[PDB]
Structure formats: C-alpha cells, structure tokens
C-alpha cells in the first residue's frame, strides 16, 4: 500500500510514490485497486505536473483489474510521458482498444455524415499515424492497407497509397479485398473514386483500375469523363480493352449515358463497340465453326414419343446445345414428334426456332419465313404467339426496328394469343433500355382483361423498367391486381415488380416490408424475387432476416420454395458456404423445400467445381418424390456446366443416368423431364458456352440472373425454359488484333490433353471464329513469345482482347 | 492481407450465427408441428373401433389377424407399438375403414 | 510490427476464440439437425 | 371431398393425355388416390380445387371455429376458466398428482433397470413431459389468481 504517501501535501512525495510504483508494482498490481479513488486526487489536480505518470500507473492497475476503455480514458489524460515508452506488453492491448474505439468512432461520425461530429482527441489519433510509422518504415503494405481500411478516412489512406516504391498495381486487388469485406456502398465508392484519380496521376496508366470503378462506382457521368479523356488523349489501341469492358460489364443505361455525352473512324468505332454487333458476328462464326454436338442422344429422345410434358422437353434441350448455329436440321430429323405437337407445343416448337437462332441479328427475321408466325387461321394461335416470342429471344438486350415490328403486330391480328410471346418480345427487347411508350401502350394492352396474357404484360413491363425503380409503374401494377380475377396476372406482375428493382439493397426494403407483411402468398413470393434481385451479389444478413423467416413460419410451400431459391441469387458470390448452411435444409419432409434448395445449390455453385454440392445432390436424385429428382437432375447439370470427366467423376455417371431414366418408361414423366433438360444444360451451346452470373471484373451479369430467376419455375409457364438462353454466355479466347483484320496466332497451354477433351507440348487455338476455353485453363496459358502478334496487355482471362503487332 | 482476411473471417461466422438462431427457431416451430402430428396419430382413428381375432405376428411391423367376422388379413401395424403388448394371441381392435393393426 | 503482425496474433485470436465458440455452437445445431431430421423422418412416418 | 370429370369417349382417335402447364395436374394426381379411385382414372379424370379469398369472411369464419380452442366469446370460456379457476380444478390436480405417484413410481424403476440391461432398450417409455402441462395449469393458477389483486382492489 504505497498510495498512502499521497495524503501528504507536497508533490515530491507523489513523484517518489510513483517511483515506487513503476518498479515493484508486479506484486502490487492488485494492491492499488481500492486506492484508485485516491489516485483520482492526482489525476484531477492540474497543478500537479506528474498527473500524467499518475495516469500511467492508474492505467497499469486498471490493466490488471481488466478495465480497458477506462485505461484508454486515462491514456488520453496521460500526456506525453505515456506514448513515449512501450515495453513488456502494454502496447498490443491499448492499441487494440484505441484503434477499435477510433475506427468505430470514425464509423459513428461517417453516418452523420457531416456536422455535430464527436470530439476526437489529438493523442489517440496521434498514436494512429505515429504507430503507423512502423508500417511505413518497415515497408509492409499488407498491414499498412489493413489499418488504412480500419480508419475509414480518406486522408491518411491517401498517404498509404502515396507511400514509396511499388505497389505497382496493388491498389486493384486491394479493392478486391475491400469489396470482399465491404459492408455498405456509402464510403466504398468515396474511397474508390480517388484511387482512379491517383492512377491518372501515376506515371504508368492502367485501365483495369478504371475498369474496376466502372463496374463498381457505376455513375453515368464518370464513364463520359474518362472516355472524353480517351478521345482527348487520341487513344485507340489500348482503349479497346476498357471500351469492351464498358459494353460487356456495364448496364445499358450506362451505355446510353456514355454515348449521349460523347456524341454531343472513332465516331463509328464507338457505335460498333457500344452496339456490340461485331461480338454477335464473331459469336455466330464461333458457334457454327466450333460446334460440337451429338445427334444420337437427340434421336434416342425423339423416338420415345411420350404424349405428356415431352412437348417442350426435346426442343428446349437441343435448342440449348445448338444455340446460335442457324443450321438447324431438327424439323428435318424429327417430324412425327413435331406432328404430335398441340396447344402450347407449337408455341415452344417455334419458340425454340428463336433460341437456336439467338444472335444473328440481321437475317433472323427473313430466314424464318417458312416458320414465320402464321396466322394462316387453322387456329394454332399459340403458334403465332410463340413466333414473336422467338423474335423476342433474339432481340433481347440491344435491338432494332424489329421491336416496333412486333409492336405493330401487337396492335394488329388477334388477341390475346399475340400478347403471350409478342409482348414478351416487346418487353424483353426493351429490357434495361428504360423504354417509355411501352409502359403506356402496355397499360391499354393490360386492360384487355384476359388471363394467360397476365404473365405476358407482367414480365414485359418488369423487364423494360429494370433498374429504373420507378413509381407510377409499380403503383399501376399494384393497382390492377385487385379487380383482376386471374392469378397469372398476379404472378407476371409479381416478377414484374420484382424485376423493376435490381441491386437496390436497403433502398427497396421500404416496399419489401409491405410485400412481406401482406397475407397474399403470391405477393409474398413477389417480395422474395424482389429482395433477391435487390440483394444480388451481397451477403448481408438483413435480407436473410425476413427472407429466411418467411422460409420458416409460412404455411405455403410454393412461396417457401421461392424463398429458399433466393439463396442462389443473393449468395452466388460466395457459393462455398451454401452447401454447409443448406445441408440439413435438403432433408426436410416436404419436397418443395428440398426442391428449391436443390435449385439454390445448383445455381449458386454452378460457376464452381465444388464437389460438396454434387455430394449433397446425390441423395436428392434418390428421393422418392419425382420433381425433387427432376430439380436434382437440372441442378446437377448446372454444377457440371462445361466441366468434363476430368473435373468431377460424376459427369458420365449422370450423363448415362439421364438417358437411362428417359428411356425407362417406368419412371415418372415429370422427373424425367429434367433428364433431357439436363442434357441440354450440360451440352448448352455445343459445350462451348455456359452460364456465368459473376464476371471476372466483380460485377454481376444482369441478363443471366434475370434469365435464370424467371426460368426458376417452368411448370406455370412452359416458354420460361427459353429465357435461360439469355443466361448462356460465350467462353472463348478471341485473338482479334483490332478492327476487322484477323491475325493468325497460336499460343501454348501447359495443361495435359485430358483437360482439353470436350465430349502437352502446346495447345492449338484460334487465331481469330475464336476457340473455346475452360476458365481453369485460362491461368495456365501463356501469350506467344515468337509470334509476330503479341498482346500489349497481360493475358489472364478469355474473351476478346487486344493483340499488338510486333 | 492479414487484417484483410481477418476482416473476412467474421462474415461466415456471423452467417453461421444467424443460421444458429434460424435453425433453432426452425426446429422449434417444426417441433410444435410434430407435436401437432402427435395429436393427429393419437386422434387417429376410431372410436368406434372393431376388435378382431388375432392369430400371430408374421414379421416386422406387420402381422396376420382375423376380424370378428373371421377372415385373416395382412396389415402393417401401428408404428409406435410394434410388439410388447401385441403378443401371439390377443384380440386387436381393427381400423374402421382399413382394419389396420392398432 | 507490434501494431501489427505480432498484434494480428491477438486480433485473429479473437476470431479464433469465437471460431471455436461458433464451432461449438455449430455442433449444437448439427446434432439437433440429426434430431430435427429424426422427427422429420418420423413426420414422414406419420405421413406414411 | 373429391373431383371428377368424364373424358370424351369420342377422343379415342386422338390421344388421351393432355394438358399443358402440368403444374396443377401433376400436383393433383398425387397421392395417386389409391387404386379403385384411380381405377376411374380410365374414362375419368380429377380437377383441381383452390380456395379463393374473400379474406375478410375467411378470417372471421377462421376465428368462428377458433372459438372452440381459444374461447367462446374470446372472453367467456377463459372467464369460465376464471369461473372454475382451480376450483374443483384441484380435483383433477389430485388425479394429476395421482398420475404423479403412479407414473413416477414406475419411472424410478426405469433408470435402475437401464443399469441392468446396459442400457437403452429404445425406449424411452414416455413417461416424459406430461405433468409439465399440469405446471402450465399452475401458470393459470398464478396468473388468474394474481388477477384477484386487480379484481378485489378497485
């Protein structure tokens, strides 16, 4: 009990008291406990010059007593004599408490955002940058960028990116670390916007960082600013990369914004690159030259001739594998099967005509003249409705006057049979374009008061308004749902008001609360697709609060199924955890939860080669219920996409299991529908193309997610199986040097030919028709060393890239 | 990198934490649904139930029984009681419609 | 670094101690998954 | 209930297997409805039934039958539980405590036998829960009798 010396007046006994403290306090760490109140006499006295060290020893006894934030308060009142001396371990704890409290105080002041901010002591932030000198002097960028992410402030972080040496490109993948652990978009884009500016101030320009902000910051004026600087810079060759990343990985309105401010040689170039016509022609040539298909399986499914559910089966399966070939022999090889078609069968029959003709924007209209939507009036009229549906599947995303060609035919001929696939063609072609008149003429078209056309105008109005988050559109869609007696207009408007909101995160939760709280199961399922598309790409637990809650306590299995399917939409960025959390959830008593969860694991891990999802899907195809085996067949084809036998051993085991159950009449027709469907999935695009929901740049692909989420339930609407063609994206290595000119280039790949088998020294590839490639084989390949044409940009992924003449 | 992945390791931790409280509330509601299913199987069936002339238990979960109208049957027995009180020779009350072993 | 990489041993340890905690709580769900699936299959037995 | 529709015998020329949009069809067939019933699936076929709302009437008629297990008026029957209220509800507690003595005197024979046979015979006898519900009626005892302080005073 040395603290009893403080009762005497003169301070020299206090300095001698703390001189006793700092030495023998090892055994006295607990002795000062009860007398800390007497230490407060020195801590509260300003005329005592050693009150600093009094707060040091008071912070030591509080360090032994377990007090942390209190030790931080006395660390602030401990003056200069505190921060100077660090020995034993007093440091890691107090700097953990200091940095923690500091970064959560900065986060506290960052939500204000401005004004009224709490006072920040200069000493606690003093030991921030002062102890950060350890990170600056030791030249450790990993920890330096770590604390730079903690402080949540742009000034000291601007000093971290300004540190010496290099760090040549390290800000790029550091933002990959940021966006991976990023919470909200508030300060994210604010930190991102200055990093592309410091890359413009850097001596070596790099377009992958401005590519990262183009797909992350996503603001309309910035792309017009950077490209106006490209035209001002007179950039041609190396801007080819970022320009195609703008077309590929950015929204349509983003393209409309950059072309709007730009147009106010290269003038025709920006038209060619933003329209993406050259990408369609090279994709067409890639699909016709490199097509690998097997007709034997199509014949074994042909001669089955089962009268139930097989109508859409074979045509949608071979329309997948053959997409974009334009060479179709199908109506020639199978005939009596197509003569069996009736009712919606001829819809899907002529709808596949557009799935296999996907792309080929020019001749797609006149080449179908034989299969054109007649309208010869021995009424098949679902026929002539599906013909315009086929023209809508090709004209999705960008388009042309054919959109008005379908619009006039919507105002002509009959009703409502034209609106079924016709308005779907009108809305799908205007998807993401924020078309105006379509919202009006679809309101007077919505008032024609029929049922099957309900899903027609609902999906159309939801596609044209995608990303617009409008007001009167959802107001009129929710206002028409009362007086109508149809449940298909409820489901079409369900996905309609779900599709209008995409990537809204918490902005849509105001409406999500009303949709989920309502007692209408169809409107609850509407809020499930709405909260899915709004939270797509984010793993935030605010969605899983109500999304998973209605997945628990609800009494309707269908909306519960759509609730557990959203795990594939929102969590697709982190597919690995889904098999673990949904493990038991596929053991549930009702097949609906086992089904939607099987679809969740299928679409989430589809872009990965994870064997765990295939392990959990093994008992799913063994379940006694039919459609849960069916969804197990479709999802198992989604996990194996483009993946051959060398990837997972279950490829051929499931391939033979598909033809087995469809050639076996004893099995259910429902469950066997997903078999031939799985043959179309796995073989889609002649194995050359697949579905990709996540681009390498880090931005989600809107038409693929929109394609698969409308493809979720094919039972209610059979033509929804055709919408999955939009989800198909080409995977290829394009050796185009520039413009129209096509160089001849072959480069080497280090993988064995067993990986190259698509049912060593160097690989043989185009030379751009490009050549197909596996995402796992893109890292092992190397640019040609001795060839005349060598890429200026480092080659990593596939697609179309610059090739420089050397 | 170290602080990076350190800030990456609480994502799945909190995700598994919200899965904890989830599956707890899940199997809490499904438990009450199983208690409701227990109210079903205990309500099932009758009241009034025709008793019948029992002969032997042939194998697991099933057995052969004559009714009080004297006809041997083959029925999967009531699940919760397989054996102990069934015995070789007794008189078992048979389901109204099905004549199930109960 | 003491800020730091030696400090990251304590930082990552907090998420390691909560990892073991959450792991212990993860098993608390795992065996009740076996019991949930137990009475769920028994719910398939009363449906059977 | 049930559903039936007579298929046309004049359709023997064409095929007997529609429809399209199999959603409600494949879901209607299940359970497959026995044999003798689906023996009528030849020459007949069922049809789907859904309940349309009309939510206000469905909600009030929902509470109409809920008067059984909730209370008659939502007031009377559990104010009738305030009428009896342990009355004469301890008589059934005496029979419940006779179920305490009865069931738990053979419940104390169970764990010793578990040590003899080593161990579980699967089992448990159940012989579980039970009087916990009697203690839930004790929650009716403590609550409704605590209402007396509100009833008696003002």
Hey, is the C-beta of C33 within 8 angstroms of any chain B C-beta?
Answer: yes
> Which chain B residues contact residue C5 at CB under 8 A?
2
CA distance B31 to chain A (A): 12
| Tokens 């009424």 -> residue | A379
Contacts of A637 (CB under 8 A, 6+ apart): A654, A677, A678, A679, A681, A682
Residues of A within an 8 Å Cβ radius of C: 86, 91-93, 95-96, 131-132, 134-135, 138, 140, 143, 147, 583-584, 587-589
Q: Give the chain A residue whose CA is nearest to the CA of B11.
A: A181
**Between chains, do D26 and A670 touch, taking CB under 8 Å as contact?**
yes
Closest CA to A317 of A683, A563, A66, A52: A683
**Between chains, do B79 and C36 touch, taking CB under 8 Å as contact?**
no
Closest CA to A49 of A6, A4, A12, A82: A12
Backbone angles phi and psi of A515, in degrees to 5: -70, -35
Q: Enumerate neighbours of B (3 or more CB pairs within 8 A).
A: A, C
Backbone angles phi and psi of A780, in degrees to 5: -80, -20
Rounded Cα distance, A559 and A490, in Å = 13
Tokens at C32, concatenated? 């009740």
Q: What value, to the nearest 5°, has the Cα angle with vertex C30 and ends C26 and C35?
A: 145
Distances (CA, A) of A266 to A237, A271, A276, A735: 11, 8, 15, 21
**Between chains, do A149 and B7 touch, taking CB under 8 Å as contact?**
yes
CA distance B26 to chain C (A): 9
**Between chains, do C10 and A96 touch, taking CB under 8 Å as contact?**
yes
Distances (CA, A) of D32 to A458, A631, B53, D21, D36: 34, 21, 32, 19, 11
**Between chains, do A552 and B22 touch, taking CB under 8 Å as contact?**
yes
Hey, is the C-beta of B14 within 8 angstroms of any chain A C-beta?
Answer: yes
Closest CA to D122 of A674, C23, B84, A701: B84
Of B7, B15, B29, the CB nearest to A541: B15
> Which chain A residues contact residue B22 at CB under 8 A?
544, 548, 552
Q: What value, to the nearest 5°, has the Cα angle with vertex A216 and ends A212 and A219?
A: 115
Contacts 24+ apart (CB under 8 A), C13-21: C15/B6, C15/B9, C15/B10, C15/B13, C18/B10, C18/B13, C19/B9, C19/B13
DSSP for A409-425, please give it. HHSSS-SSHHHHHHHHH
Per DSSP, A294 falls in state -
Per DSSP, A782 falls in state B
Q: Enumerate neighbours of C (3 or more CB pairs within 8 A).
A: A, B
Distances (CA, A) of A717 to A338, A345, A569, A672, A733: 20, 12, 21, 18, 36
Q: Which of A181, A571, A573 to mutate to probe the B interface, most B CBs <10 Å?
A: A181
Whether A124 contacts A102, CB under 8 Å: yes
- Elucidation technique: cryo-EM
**Between chains, do B23 and C36 touch, taking CB under 8 Å as contact?**
yes
Tokens at A290, concatenated? 């490199």
Whether A432 contacts A702, CB under 8 Å: yes
How many CB pairs (< 8 A) connect B and C?
Answer: 53
DSSP for D100-128, please give it. HHHHHHHHSSHHHHHHHHTS--S---S--
> Which chain C residues contact residue B43 at CB under 8 A?
none
Rounded Cα distance, A227 and A215, in Å = 15
Of A146, A552, A574, the CB nearest to B25: A552
Closest CA to A376 of A330, A413, A324, A431: A413
CA distance B10 to chain C (A): 7
Of A181, A548, A553, the CB nearest to B7: A181
Return the exposure string of A268-286: e unless at least 16 CB atoms fall within 10 Å of the residue's CB, then b. eebeebbbbeebbebbbeb
How does strand A732-734 pair with strand B62-66?
unpaired
Whether A62 contacts A56, CB under 8 Å: no
**Between chains, do A135 and C3 touch, taking CB under 8 Å as contact?**
yes
Q: What is the resolution of this structure in A?
A: 6.8
């Amino acid at each position: 009990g040395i603290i009893s010396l403080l009762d005497e007046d003169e301070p020299q006994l206090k300095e001698f008291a703390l001189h006793k403290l700092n030495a023998v306090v090892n055994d006295f760490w607990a002795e000062i406990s009860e007398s800390v109140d007497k230490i407060e006499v020195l801590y509260e006295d300003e005329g005592f010059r050693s009150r600093q060290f009094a707060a040091l020893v008071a912070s030591k006894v509080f360090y032994h007593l377990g007090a942390f934030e209190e030790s931080l308060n006395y660390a602030l009142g401990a003056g200069d004599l505190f921060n100077v001396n660090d020995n034993s371990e007093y440091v890691e704890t107090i700097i953990a408490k200091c940095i923690d409290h500091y970064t959560k105080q900065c986060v506290e002041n960052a939500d204000l955002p401005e004004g009224e901010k709490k006072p920040i002591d200069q000493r606690l932030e003093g030991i921030v940058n002062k102890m950060f000198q350890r990170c600056l002097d030791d030249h450790k960028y990993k920890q330096a960028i770590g604390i730079a992410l903690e402080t949540r402030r742009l000034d000291v972080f601007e000093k971290t990116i300004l540190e010496s040496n290099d760090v040549p490109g390290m800000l790029a993948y550091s933002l990959k670390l940021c966006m991976s652990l990023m919470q909200n978009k508030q300060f994210r884009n604010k930190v991102l916007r200055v990093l592309v500016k410091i890359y413009m101030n850097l001596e070596k320009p790099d377009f992958i960082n401005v590519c990262q902000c183009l797909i992350f910051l996503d603001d309309p004026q910035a792309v017009s600013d950077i490209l106006e600087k490209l035209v001002k810079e007179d950039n041609l060759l190396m801007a080819y990369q970022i320009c195609f990343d703008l077309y590929e990985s950015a929204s349509q309105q983003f393209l409309s914004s950059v072309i709007q401010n730009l147009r106010t040689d290269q003038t025709l170039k920006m038209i060619k690159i933003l329209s993406g016509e050259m990408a369609i022609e090279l994709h067409l040539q890639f699909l016709i030259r490199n097509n690998n298909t097997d007709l034997m399986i199509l014949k074994n499914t042909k001669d089955a001739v089962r009268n139930s559910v097989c109508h859409t089966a074979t045509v949608i399966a071979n329309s997948f594998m053959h997409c974009g070939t334009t060479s179709d022999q199908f109506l020639r090889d199978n005939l009596e099967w197509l003569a069996r078609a009736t009712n919606w069968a001829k819809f899907t029959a002529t709808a596949s005509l557009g799935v296999i003709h996907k792309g080929h924007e020019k001749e797609a209209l006149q080449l179908m003249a034989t299969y054109l939507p007649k309208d010869t009036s021995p009424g098949s009229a679902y026929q002539e409705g599906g013909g315009l549906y086929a023209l809508g599947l090709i004209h999705a995303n960008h388009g042309g006057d054919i959109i008005d060609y379908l619009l006039n035919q919507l105002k002509n001929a009959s009703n409502d049979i034209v609106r079924h696939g016709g308005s779907l063609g009108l809305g799908l072609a205007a998807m993401g374009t924020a078309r105006q008149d379509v919202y009006d003429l679809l309101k007077t078209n919505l008032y024609q008061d029929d049922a099957v056309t309900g899903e027609a105008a609902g999906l159309a109005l939801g596609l044209v308004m995608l990303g617009s988050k409008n007001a009167q559109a959802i107001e009129d869609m929710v206002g028409y749902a009362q007086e109508t007696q149809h449940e298909k207009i409820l489901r079409g408007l369900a996905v309609g008001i779900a599709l209008v909101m995409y990537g809204r995160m918490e902005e849509a939760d105001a409406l999500i609360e009303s949709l989920c709280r309502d007692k209408d199961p169809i409107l609850r399922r509407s809020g499930m697709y709405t909260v899915a598309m709004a939270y797509c790409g984010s793993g935030n637990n605010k969605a899983i609060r109500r999304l998973l809650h209605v997945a628990v306590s609800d009494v309707n299995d269908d909306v519960r199924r759509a609730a557990v399917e959203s795990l594939g939409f929102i969590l697709f960025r982190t597919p690995e955890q889904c098999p673990s959390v949904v493990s038991l959830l596929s053991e549930s008593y009702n097949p609906h939860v086992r089904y939607g969860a099987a679809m969740a694991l299928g679409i989430c891990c589809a872009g990965t080669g994870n064997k765990e999802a295939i392990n959990l899907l093994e008992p799913m195809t063994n379940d006694p219920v039919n459609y849960v085996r069916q969804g197990a067949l479709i999802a198992s084809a989604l996990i194996m996409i483009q993946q051959t036998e060398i990837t997972c051993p279950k490829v051929n085991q499931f391939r033979q299991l598909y033809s087995k159950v469809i050639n076996d009449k004893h099995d259910d027709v429902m469950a066997k529908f997903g078999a031939i469907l799985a043959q179309g999935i796995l073989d889609a695009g002649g194995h050359n193309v697949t579905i990709s929901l996540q681009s390498r740049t880090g931005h989600t692909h809107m038409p693929s997610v929109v394609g698969v989420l409308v493809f979720t339930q094919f039972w209610f609407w059979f033509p929804l199986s055709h919408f999955l063609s939009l989800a198909y994206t080409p995977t290829c290595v394009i050796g185009l040097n520039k413009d129209l000119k096509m160089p001849k280039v072959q480069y080497k790949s280090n993988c064995k030919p067993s990986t190259f088998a698509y049912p060593t020294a160097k690989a043989k590839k185009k030379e751009k028709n490009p050549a197909r490639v596996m995402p796992a084989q893109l890292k092992v390949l190397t640019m040609p060393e001795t060839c005349r044409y060598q890429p200026f940009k480092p080659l990593s992924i596939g697609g179309i890239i610059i090739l420089k003449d050397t | 990198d170290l602080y990076s992945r350190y800030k990456k390791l609480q994502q799945e931790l909190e995700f598994l934490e919200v899965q904890e409280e989830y599956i707890k509330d899940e199997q809490k509601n499904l438990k009450k649904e199983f208690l409701h299913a227990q109210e079903e199987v205990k309500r099932i069936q009758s009241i009034p139930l025709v008793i019948g002339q029992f002969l032997e238990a042939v194998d697991q979960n099933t057995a052969i029984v004559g009714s009080t109208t004297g006809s041997n049957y083959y029925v999967r027995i009531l699940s919760t009681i397989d054996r102990e009180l069934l015995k070789p020779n007794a008189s078992v009350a048979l389901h109204k419609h099905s004549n199930a072993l109960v | 670094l003491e800020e730091g990489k030696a400090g990251s041993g304590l930082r990552q340890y907090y998420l390691s101690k909560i990892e073991e905690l959450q792991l212990i709580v993860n098993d608390k769900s795992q065996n009740l998954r076996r019991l949930q699936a137990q009475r769920n299959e028994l719910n398939a037995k009363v449906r059977l | 209930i049930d559903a039936f529709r007579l298929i046309n015998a004049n359709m023997m020329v064409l095929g007997h297997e529609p429809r399209q949009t199999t959603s409600n069809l494949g879901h209607l067939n299940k359970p497959s409805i026995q044999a003798l019933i689906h023996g009528l699936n030849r020459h007949y076929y069922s049809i789907t039934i859904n309940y349309r709302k009309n939510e206000l009437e469905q909600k009030m008629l929902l509470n109409l039958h809920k008067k059984s297990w909730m209370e008659g008026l939502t007031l009377q029957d559990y104010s009738e539980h305030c009428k009896h209220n342990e009355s004469v509800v301890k008589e059934m507690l005496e029979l419940a405590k006779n179920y305490n003595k009865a069931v738990e005197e053979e419940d104390k024979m169970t764990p010793e036998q578990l040590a003899i046979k080593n161990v579980g015979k699967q089992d448990p006898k159940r012989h579980l829960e039970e009087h916990v519900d009697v203690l839930m009626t004790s929650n009716i005892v403590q609550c409704l009798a605590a209402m007396l302080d509100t009833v008696v005073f003002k």
